[model samples]
Target: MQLSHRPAETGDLETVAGFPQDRDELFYCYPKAIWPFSVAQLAAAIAERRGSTVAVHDGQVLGFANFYQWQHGDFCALGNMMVAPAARGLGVARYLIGVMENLAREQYKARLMKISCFNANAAGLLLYTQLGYQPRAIAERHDPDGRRVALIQMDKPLE
Candidate 1:
């Protein structure tokens, strides 16, 4: 199947809002969003975010991401990044991230791309590392169940 990346359409959010399979996964994708993510919630979040994008394989939305923080010419931090359950273990995330890097650099003139992963998201942490992201900082956080966790902030050059 041919894969491509582009700015998300309103309808695409409907598909992506369902990507988080469980509560914990929802927290990983969007901590502020409630469990059983809804299109409205996703839309509201994107209203405050920038560059809501999706990776599409044929007609299916395979991945979603957006920029939450944009310090033009310096850095742009990604938020709500997730892949369809069926799309995981594939290269969808890498493709989405590469597109985001180009968007950040060309549109925002950003030199750095940033992303955050909670300590428990092992796959995400590994994926980011394998994609050439380096740990830039760590912040303390607590899960919804009050369990202590680490928020690992990672960065990559936007070349």
Candidate 2:
């Protein structure tokens, strides 16, 4: 699918706000964003994040991620990463990650980056690993389903 990176608009966040519907979708990607995400929360997130970006095709938002900084002149991170169900397996997730990383490097001059996801999130782990992220640590997260999932931490050096 053709893709383009753009500054996120209110409509973009609103459209993808409810992208996660179940435990798998929610925990797999958006660990920070709660379901039934309101437009107001999205507005707050876009502001709270170091920055926000959207992946669009034609005029529709296909995916998005929120970027943040961990320390001054040290590292950056991405959270609230998610892609529309219909857009999954179409490389939308990979595109969004790469775009967000490039956007971060451009804006932050970051030399390293960190990102984490539920270890139960197979797709996310594979995506990050394929992009040269090395798994670093893991912690337990009792999901709403009461399952203790491993929250895997991964990092990449951006020389």
Candidate 3:
């Protein structure tokens, strides 16, 4: 699939907001957001994460991601990643991650790209590892239901 990405615009929020299918998936993408992701919620998030970006193919949004934290010459962290349901299995996630990494390296001049995934997110772990990200730490956290889970922090050096 031909993919192109750019800084997310307000017009893209509606499609990106609907990407999460359920509570668990929504939490995985945005822990603070309640289930049934809404455009308002996404708008607020984008406000905080001004580096938010969207992957597009033929003018339709296929994936969304952003830098939740960026420190110039240091590192940038990935946040709120999700692919449109119909876009799954088409390698959109990898392309979205690549877009973020490029923004971090070229725009922010970041030396490292950081990502955090919950232990329950098996696919995320696999993708990050396969993309050359190495585990940095594991922090314990509770799910919305109070179940203990591991938040795995991983990083890939840009320099």
Candidate 4:
């Protein structure tokens, strides 16, 4: 469906902010983006980062995949990724991530890409698996409301 990607731009934030889903706790990078996401905050955070990339199809932004380098110079950690509901099953997220991986390796000189998804996020797990990510660990985090949550960690080495 003519999938493509590019560095994120200002307009993408408005669309991301109006998303009906409350996926704050699912993303470590986007944590506490409470009910009624804020375009300013999301945009600020994404723009402040190095991996602010977007996936577009036919000129519309369908998803964003942002990442950052970890303590290990060769490892880049990904988070706060999102895809519009209508864009699911169309490889929008996959194309976004592939672009991120390429950026990590090329610009950041990264050797590995790491990501974490809430254990309950079935879609995320399947998507990562399909993209060649292998499980690395299980971890816990305290949600904003103080609830302990489980997360699955996955990683893939860049070529």
TM-score of each: 0.96, 0.88, 0.96, 0.88
Q: After superposition, how far is residue 20 of candidate 1 from its true place, in Å?
A: 0.1
- Candidate 3: worst 10 consecutive residues by lDDT? 45-54
Best of the two (3, 4) by lDDT:
3
Off by over 4 Å in 4: 23-29, 70-73
The lDDT per prediction is 0.90, 0.78, 0.90, 0.76
- Model 1 lDDT tens row, 1-159: 478888888888779988999999999879888777899999998899999999989789999999999998899999899899988988998888888999999999999999999988999999899989999999998778888889999999978
Instruction: Compose the digit string of candidate 2's lDDT tens values, residues 5-62.
Output: 8878876767877677685776565555566567777778788876687888877798
| Candidate number that wins on TM-score, 3 or 4 | 3
Off by over 4 Å in 2: 145-147
lDDT for 78 in candidate 1 is 91
Model 4 lDDT per residue over 11-68, tens place: 7888766543655533444664665568877876776667787778887878876774
Candidate 1 pairs with clashing backbones: none
